[PDB]
Amino acid sequence: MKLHELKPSEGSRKTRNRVGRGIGSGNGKTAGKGHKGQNARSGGGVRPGFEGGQMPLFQRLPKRGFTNINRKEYAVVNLDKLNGFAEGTEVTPELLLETGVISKLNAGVKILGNGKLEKKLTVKANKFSASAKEAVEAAGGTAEVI
Template sequence: MKLNELSPSVPKKNRKRIGRGNSSGWGKTAGKGSNGQNSRAGGGVKPYFEGGQMPIYRRVPKRGFSNTIFKKEYTVISLSFLNDNFEDGEEVSLETLFNKCLIKKGRDGVKILGNGELNKKLTVKVHKISKSAKAAVEAKGGTVELVEVKGFERAESNK
């Protein structure tokens, strides 16, 4: 047996070449039936189109307020998490958390909550911190520094 004599155990299924002559069985209308919107290239109605009547998304009243575009999404971390992953006297910041692979980048910052206990003196530089967490860090002799979230800088030409 030679390499050119090898064949797969399950032979390849030939693809259906539509619109390639009447003798193929899929010629002329190529399986699309006769004329009309659905027989044209790119034809067919959108799934939400309701035949011209007022669509449901316009019939239903609008309610409430959405701030999803400008919403800030913080990575939330507890005091017990800091206690488990940092040594005494270490600095807790976005960079150190990312370098230790404890968080993923891409959010608007880090917020520390007061869940659990803290038994170490830490220097905390984060974007937000709860009152109870701040009190716990300062009670152990640590310091808390709030860092600003970097927003979009306006170009000089656009001012």
């Protein structure tokens, strides 16, 4: 480019709307807020979820359940992702994490049975779905728990 002929990508930048700058714009005078009432006032409007005094929806409904302190979330890997490795590879959490197949380990790798595994692999993971274990063993490979 040249600094004297700069041009933004078409549709990347719009002009901001400036209210209360005359009648021609279509937002003169009342600046698009209509006439009077709480919504037209500076700082105005009721708080989110407020229904003008009708009991709000959240308060009408019951709280449900609890949160487990000891909740475990596994990094799930479906069979389709294991298909990307080389044949006879020892697939591990550390390799999965290093290759970028998983972003975060959390409580461990769990292998799940979505998709198809052609390649023979020694998969070492914390958990397997019953499907996934079967599918790994059916492809010739091994499903070691670690």
